[PDB]
Amino acid sequence: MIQQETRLKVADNSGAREVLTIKVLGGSGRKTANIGDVIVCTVKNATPGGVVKKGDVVKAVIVRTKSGVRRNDGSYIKFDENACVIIRDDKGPRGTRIFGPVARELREGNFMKIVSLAPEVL
Amino acid sequence: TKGILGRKIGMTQVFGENGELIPVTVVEAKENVVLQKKTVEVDGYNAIQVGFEDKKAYKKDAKSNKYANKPAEGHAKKADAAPKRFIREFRNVDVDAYEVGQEVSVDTFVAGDVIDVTGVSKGKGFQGAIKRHGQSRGPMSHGSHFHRAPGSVGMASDASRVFKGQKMPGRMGGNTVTVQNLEVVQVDTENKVILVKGNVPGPKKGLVEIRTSIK
Amino acid sequence: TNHKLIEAVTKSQLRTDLPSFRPGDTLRVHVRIIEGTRERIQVFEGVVIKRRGGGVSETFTVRKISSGVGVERTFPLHTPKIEKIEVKRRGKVRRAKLYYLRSLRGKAARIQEI
Amino acid sequence: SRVGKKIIDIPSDVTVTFDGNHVTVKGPKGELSRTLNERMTFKQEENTIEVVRPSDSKEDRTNHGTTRALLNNMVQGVSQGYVKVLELVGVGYRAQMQGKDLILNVGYSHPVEIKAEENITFSVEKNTVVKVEGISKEQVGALASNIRSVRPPEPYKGKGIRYQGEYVRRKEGKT
RNA sequence: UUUGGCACCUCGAUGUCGGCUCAUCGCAUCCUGGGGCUGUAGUCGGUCCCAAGGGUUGGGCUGUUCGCCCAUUAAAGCGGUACGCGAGCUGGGUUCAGAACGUCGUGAGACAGUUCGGUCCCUAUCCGUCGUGGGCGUAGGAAAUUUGAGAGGAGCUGUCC
RNA sequence: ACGGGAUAAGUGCUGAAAGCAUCUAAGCAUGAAGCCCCCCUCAAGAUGAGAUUUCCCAACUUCGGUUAUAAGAUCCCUCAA
Structure with a gap:
C-alpha cells in the first residue's frame, strides 16, 4: 500500500538520499500507486554534494515496492523495502550508478535506458 | 441463441495458452431437456420452455420434494421425459431449430464465445447501509457519536417528509444479475461441464442460466 | 462425480515431471523469460518459504538477497513457464512457512544443511 | 417575399399528368410523381398551364408559387436535366x-x-x-x-x- | 441569492455559526459535447448558440465567515432547500458564571481591545422511507411457467497504438 | 458502449405575400453524456386482477349438504446455498 505522506528511498547517485511524496499523479482523484508509475516528491535528506539538494521539489519513478506485484504469468514478485528514482522529464535519470535490484515491468515503462543502467533485473 | 442451464460448483485457475493464468468457474450443465415449445399465437410469444435436472418420480406420502406430483408428471409426459426439478424459458433463441424431447448438450457451445450469464446473488441478511451501499462512515474518535449509522434522511421541514429512493438499511439478499460479455474456455462432454472465465453470481450448487451474448 | 469432478478435468492441465521436497531448502529454477525478442531462459536461485494446498493451487515461494536486498518470488507449481528445477540443497526446518526470515540478513539469515 | 413576376409555369413535351393530389412528370423523360398542393388546382389546356390562384390567400398564393416554380423545376430537370x-x-x-x-x-x-x-x-x-x-x-x-x-x-x-x-x-x- | 426599511406569526420558548455524514432541485455551465463565429488558417484567445445528462481533487495556513498558498486534474462552477439537515454527530466558536491585560469610568462597573478556561435531554404514537410478512380476491379448483401496464437503474472520462 | 430515429444548436439548398431570394411557416438531412427507443431489474392487489400447459371432479347428490373427499395443502419433524 503506497500513499502520499509516505517516506520513499532512492537508489541513485543524483544527490538525494531520502524523499517523501506529495502526489500520485494520473487521474482526477487518483490516490495510490505501485511499481511502474511517476510521482512528485520532496527531499527530507540530501546527499552532501550531488545535484539535487535538500528541500527541493522533484519527480521520480517507482521501483521494487514491498507491495510487489503479480503478472499475467500468474506469479508473484515481492521485496522487503521500496525505493524510487529521480528523472528529468525525459525518462532520463540524474544519478547514474543505480544500486540494488529492479523489476522487468518497466521496459513497458520505457526506462529500458535505466534497465541497461541497472544491475540485475527481474 | 443457444441458452443453457446448470449449477455452479467451484472456482479454479488454469494455465491456458502463453502459460497464462486464468481464474475460472466450473459449470455442470446436464440432462438439459426441452419440456415445451411455446409459440407466438398459441402462448403469445414465440419461445421455448426448458428443464434442467431430472428427479425422483411420482410416489406417495411425498413429505418432501425430491418427487413430483400429478400435473408435474402430466407435463413431463407430454414429451417423453422424467421429473425435472428446475424449469425456465427462453425467448432469445430460435426454436424451429429445436425439437421437443431433445436433451441439448454442453457441446452446443464452444470455447471462445461471448455469454451473458444469469444467476442470483447469494444473499447475506439484514445489513447496515455502508455495507448495503457504498457509504463511507464517520469518525470513531475526537469525541464522536456517529460511527456507522447514516445522518441525514432528506431535506428540511420544507418537504416535511422523507423521499423514496433512500438507501436505508435492509435485507441483503440473493437477487437477479445479468453478467455480460464473458468467455468460454473448454467444453467438456464426458462429465459435460463448461469452464468459464472468472466468477458468477450465486453460491455453490446453485444455479445458472447462460446464453450466447451479443454485445 | 459430484466431488472428484474438478480434478477429473484439471489433471489434464496439470504437470507431472516436477520433483518433490519440503521447504527449508536451497533451490535453483530455470525459467522461460519470454521477452519481446525470444524465450530466453534464466535461473533464479533461492530459499523456499512456503507452499500450500493441492492442484493448480499448489503454489510455492522462495527468497533471495540481490544486493543486500531481500527479494521474493512466488510461483505456480504447475505452470508451463518453468524450464526446470534443481534441489541445490536442503535444510532442517521446523515450520511449514518461514516468515521470520523476511527481516534478517547474513549470518542472521543463516541456514542449516538438510 | 417578392417572387411573383413569373407565374406562368407552361408545360413541355414532358406531360404533367395527375395522380390525385399527386402530379406526374411523364412523356419523353418522366414518370416522377409528386404532390403539387391541395387547393392549388393545376390545369393544362393543350400545352400551356399556370397555377390557378384560388382566393390568393397567404397560404394559397404561397402555394401557387410553390407549385409553379416546382413544376418549373420538374419540366426543367426531368425533361432537360x-x-x-x-x-x-x-x-x-x-x-x-x-x-x-x-x-x-x-x-x-x-x-x-x-x-x-x-x-x-x-x-x-x-x-x-x-x-x-x-x-x-x-x-x-x-x-x-x-x-x-x-x-x-x-x-x-x-x-x-x-x-x-x-x-x-x-x-x-x-x- | 447584499446592506437595509415595515413589525404579521411566533417570547405559557419555532433553541445554536461552522464543520461531519447524507443529500436533493436548478442553470444564469466549470469539464466534457456540439455547432457557428473573431483582430479564429486548427489550436488560439475570444465569441454566440445549443446545451444540465453527468461530474466537479488533496493538503498547508485563519472558530473566524474568509481568503492565500503547495501539488494535481478535463475541470477543480455558480446557486436553492429554516443563511439544505443537530428529536443524525461534534461545538472550534460565541454566552453563561472565574481570571488577566489595555482603555474609559470618582467608583460600583463598562468596553470589545484581546487572551486562558469553562454541562449539548428524549424507551418513536401518527404520517413518511427502507424492507418484511399476514389477511382476503381475481365465477370451477390446484401446480408450475409466464406476457408486461408500467416503475426504477443505467450512460463519466482520459490515454497509446 | 452504443445503434437508431425524431430533434436541437444549428448547418447546405426552390416558393408568393411585401411581383428577387433564401440552412422550418412544407423539404432535405443533420446532430447533443438532451429526448425516444438501447440495455438491466421489479412488476396481473395491473380490485382490470392478464396468458399457456398440466392435474383434479361429489358417491350421495338444489352434487345443495353430508361424511367425505381427490389435484392438492398445511400441522409436525431433520436441516441450510
Whole structure:
C-alpha cells in the first residue's frame, strides 16, 4: 500500500538520499500507486554534494515496492523495502550508478535506458 | 441463441495458452431437456420452455420434494421425459431449430464465445447501509457519536417528509444479475461441464442460466 | 462425480515431471523469460518459504538477497513457464512457512544443511 | 417575399399528368410523381398551364408559387436535366479520385473514403468539370448546393468543392 | 441569492455559526459535447448558440465567515432547500458564571481591545422511507411457467497504438 | 458502449405575400453524456386482477349438504446455498 505522506528511498547517485511524496499523479482523484508509475516528491535528506539538494521539489519513478506485484504469468514478485528514482522529464535519470535490484515491468515503462543502467533485473 | 442451464460448483485457475493464468468457474450443465415449445399465437410469444435436472418420480406420502406430483408428471409426459426439478424459458433463441424431447448438450457451445450469464446473488441478511451501499462512515474518535449509522434522511421541514429512493438499511439478499460479455474456455462432454472465465453470481450448487451474448 | 469432478478435468492441465521436497531448502529454477525478442531462459536461485494446498493451487515461494536486498518470488507449481528445477540443497526446518526470515540478513539469515 | 413576376409555369413535351393530389412528370423523360398542393388546382389546356390562384390567400398564393416554380423545376430537370457544373480541389492530404468514388489520405487513424450518387449524372469531363444532372431544385438543387458544403474551399489555402462561379478567400492567419 | 426599511406569526420558548455524514432541485455551465463565429488558417484567445445528462481533487495556513498558498486534474462552477439537515454527530466558536491585560469610568462597573478556561435531554404514537410478512380476491379448483401496464437503474472520462 | 430515429444548436439548398431570394411557416438531412427507443431489474392487489400447459371432479347428490373427499395443502419433524 503506497500513499502520499509516505517516506520513499532512492537508489541513485543524483544527490538525494531520502524523499517523501506529495502526489500520485494520473487521474482526477487518483490516490495510490505501485511499481511502474511517476510521482512528485520532496527531499527530507540530501546527499552532501550531488545535484539535487535538500528541500527541493522533484519527480521520480517507482521501483521494487514491498507491495510487489503479480503478472499475467500468474506469479508473484515481492521485496522487503521500496525505493524510487529521480528523472528529468525525459525518462532520463540524474544519478547514474543505480544500486540494488529492479523489476522487468518497466521496459513497458520505457526506462529500458535505466534497465541497461541497472544491475540485475527481474 | 443457444441458452443453457446448470449449477455452479467451484472456482479454479488454469494455465491456458502463453502459460497464462486464468481464474475460472466450473459449470455442470446436464440432462438439459426441452419440456415445451411455446409459440407466438398459441402462448403469445414465440419461445421455448426448458428443464434442467431430472428427479425422483411420482410416489406417495411425498413429505418432501425430491418427487413430483400429478400435473408435474402430466407435463413431463407430454414429451417423453422424467421429473425435472428446475424449469425456465427462453425467448432469445430460435426454436424451429429445436425439437421437443431433445436433451441439448454442453457441446452446443464452444470455447471462445461471448455469454451473458444469469444467476442470483447469494444473499447475506439484514445489513447496515455502508455495507448495503457504498457509504463511507464517520469518525470513531475526537469525541464522536456517529460511527456507522447514516445522518441525514432528506431535506428540511420544507418537504416535511422523507423521499423514496433512500438507501436505508435492509435485507441483503440473493437477487437477479445479468453478467455480460464473458468467455468460454473448454467444453467438456464426458462429465459435460463448461469452464468459464472468472466468477458468477450465486453460491455453490446453485444455479445458472447462460446464453450466447451479443454485445 | 459430484466431488472428484474438478480434478477429473484439471489433471489434464496439470504437470507431472516436477520433483518433490519440503521447504527449508536451497533451490535453483530455470525459467522461460519470454521477452519481446525470444524465450530466453534464466535461473533464479533461492530459499523456499512456503507452499500450500493441492492442484493448480499448489503454489510455492522462495527468497533471495540481490544486493543486500531481500527479494521474493512466488510461483505456480504447475505452470508451463518453468524450464526446470534443481534441489541445490536442503535444510532442517521446523515450520511449514518461514516468515521470520523476511527481516534478517547474513549470518542472521543463516541456514542449516538438510 | 417578392417572387411573383413569373407565374406562368407552361408545360413541355414532358406531360404533367395527375395522380390525385399527386402530379406526374411523364412523356419523353418522366414518370416522377409528386404532390403539387391541395387547393392549388393545376390545369393544362393543350400545352400551356399556370397555377390557378384560388382566393390568393397567404397560404394559397404561397402555394401557387410553390407549385409553379416546382413544376418549373420538374419540366426543367426531368425533361432537360437539372444540370449543375462544379469543380474540386483537395491538397496535401491525398484527396484522390476513384472514378465513381474517391479516397482521402486525410491520414487520420484511417484515411477516409467518399462515393458518388444515384439517379443523378455525375458526368466528369476532366475530373474537375463535374456536371450534376437531376430533376429539381428542392432535392437536387439541394444536392448541387450541398456538394459545395461537403468539403468547401477552406480559405487560407483554398482546397474544397467549388462551383464554376465560386472563389477562394483568405483569413487573418494569426494563431 | 447584499446592506437595509415595515413589525404579521411566533417570547405559557419555532433553541445554536461552522464543520461531519447524507443529500436533493436548478442553470444564469466549470469539464466534457456540439455547432457557428473573431483582430479564429486548427489550436488560439475570444465569441454566440445549443446545451444540465453527468461530474466537479488533496493538503498547508485563519472558530473566524474568509481568503492565500503547495501539488494535481478535463475541470477543480455558480446557486436553492429554516443563511439544505443537530428529536443524525461534534461545538472550534460565541454566552453563561472565574481570571488577566489595555482603555474609559470618582467608583460600583463598562468596553470589545484581546487572551486562558469553562454541562449539548428524549424507551418513536401518527404520517413518511427502507424492507418484511399476514389477511382476503381475481365465477370451477390446484401446480408450475409466464406476457408486461408500467416503475426504477443505467450512460463519466482520459490515454497509446 | 452504443445503434437508431425524431430533434436541437444549428448547418447546405426552390416558393408568393411585401411581383428577387433564401440552412422550418412544407423539404432535405443533420446532430447533443438532451429526448425516444438501447440495455438491466421489479412488476396481473395491473380490485382490470392478464396468458399457456398440466392435474383434479361429489358417491350421495338444489352434487345443495353430508361424511367425505381427490389435484392438492398445511400441522409436525431433520436441516441450510
